[PDB]
Amino acid sequence: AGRIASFLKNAWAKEPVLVASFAIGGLAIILPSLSPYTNYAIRINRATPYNYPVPLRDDGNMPDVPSHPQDPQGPSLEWLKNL
């Protein structure tokens, strides 16, 4: 405790560059595992349509698949609009 604090105080003097670099690197490593918006970023990446959405062959047993784009069935991007 005291030794660690003394070492940090000594490093903060005459060596600020290394302390700042290590602090920034440690924060960059640690914080993403705690930030809740990384899931939002993953969802935004997954919600980006790059290819043409190929339609499925309807057989009368697809309740979750919409028949038209304006139909309520299917994923919604209202959360992205609200961001």
Ligand X SMILES: CCCCCCCC/C=C\CCCCCCCC(=O)O[C@H](COC(=O)CCCCCCC/C=C/CCCCCCCC)COP(=O)(O)OCCN
- Residues within the interface to ligand X (CB under 6 A): 11, 15, 18-19, 21-23, 25-26, 29
| Angstrom distance (rounded) from CA 20 to CA 70 | 52
Are 66 and 72 in contact by the 8 Å Cβ rule? The answer is yes
By the rule CB under 8 A, 51 interacts with other proteins: yes
By the rule CB under 8 A, 57 interacts with other proteins: no
Minimum CB separation of residue 15 from ligand X in Å reads 5
| Angstrom distance (rounded) from CA 65 to CA 68 | 9
State the virtual CA torsion across 62, 68, 74, 76 in degrees, nearest 10: -170
Q: Which two tokens stand for residue 73?
A: 């069935």
In terms of CB distance, is 52 or 64 closer to other proteins?
A: 52
In terms of CB distance, is 35 or 76 closer to ligand X?
A: 35
Minimum CB separation of residue 18 from ligand X in Å reads 4
